[PDB]
Design an enzyme around this catalytic site. Sequence first.
Site, PDB file in Angstrom:
ATOM      1  CG  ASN A  15     -11.049   6.161   0.453  1.00  0.00           C
ATOM      2  OD1 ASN A  15     -11.117   7.382   0.375  1.00  0.00           O
ATOM      3  ND2 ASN A  15     -11.515   5.360  -0.502  1.00  0.00           N
ATOM      4  CB  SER A  75     -11.892   9.869  -1.434  1.00  0.00           C
ATOM      5  OG  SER A  75     -11.624   8.777  -2.309  1.00  0.00           O
ATOM      6  CG  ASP A 133     -13.894   8.646  -4.694  1.00  0.00           C
ATOM      7  OD1 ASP A 133     -12.698   8.986  -4.437  1.00  0.00           O
ATOM      8  OD2 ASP A 133     -14.568   7.887  -3.960  1.00  0.00           O
ATOM      9  CG  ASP A 139      -6.600   5.663  -0.668  1.00  0.00           C
ATOM     10  OD1 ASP A 139      -7.760   5.948  -0.319  1.00  0.00           O
ATOM     11  OD2 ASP A 139      -6.358   4.817  -1.553  1.00  0.00           O
ATOM     12  CG  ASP A 161     -15.913  -2.865   7.368  1.00  0.00           C
ATOM     13  OD1 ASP A 161     -15.569  -3.996   6.952  1.00  0.00           O
ATOM     14  OD2 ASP A 161     -15.796  -1.843   6.660  1.00  0.00           O
ATOM     15  CD  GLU A 188      -3.129  -0.638   0.114  1.00  0.00           C
ATOM     16  OE1 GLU A 188      -3.117   0.489  -0.433  1.00  0.00           O
ATOM     17  OE2 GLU A 188      -3.986  -1.495  -0.157  1.00  0.00           O
ATOM     18  CG  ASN A 209      -8.843   6.893  -3.632  1.00  0.00           C
ATOM     19  OD1 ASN A 209      -8.030   6.017  -3.900  1.00  0.00           O
ATOM     20  ND2 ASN A 209      -9.257   7.130  -2.398  1.00  0.00           N
TER      21      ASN A 209
END
Length: 129
Positions: free
Chosen positions: A59, A50, A48, A52, A101, A35, A46
């Site tokens: 994110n 957003s 969209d 990271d 989650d 990562e 990203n």
Amino acid sequence: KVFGRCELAAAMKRHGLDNYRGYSLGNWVCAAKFESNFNTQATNRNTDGSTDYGILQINSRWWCNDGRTPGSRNLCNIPCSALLSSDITASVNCAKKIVSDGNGMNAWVAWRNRCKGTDVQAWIRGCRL
Ligand SMILES: [Cl-]
Ligand SMILES: [Cl-]
Ligand code: NA
């Protein structure tokens, strides 16, 4: 800060990631390698809008507030800049919420594509833990 492999493994173990939700330490070290190349200051925009952040590329669409992702959530209740610190506590604590989650470590695209189903214990071989 750019961590060494075994340095990061020891830090993650101290913060309780070894076998957290059933994921052995090597999974977490492998995910961080692909990562962020072990760099706490890594950022990537990203598609969209957003971004990271940090060693585990968390994110801003869902997990932290960076003031420039309209309509997003802040489920870890932290500014995204806290995820860039040389102290990995904030990243680890938020990662524990993500992996809990329901989707496990599949939340991390590099883990799914480059760590899942491989010999991840190789990533902690030779380290003092
Ligand atoms: Cl392992
Ligand atoms: Cl799982
Ligand atoms: Na956000």
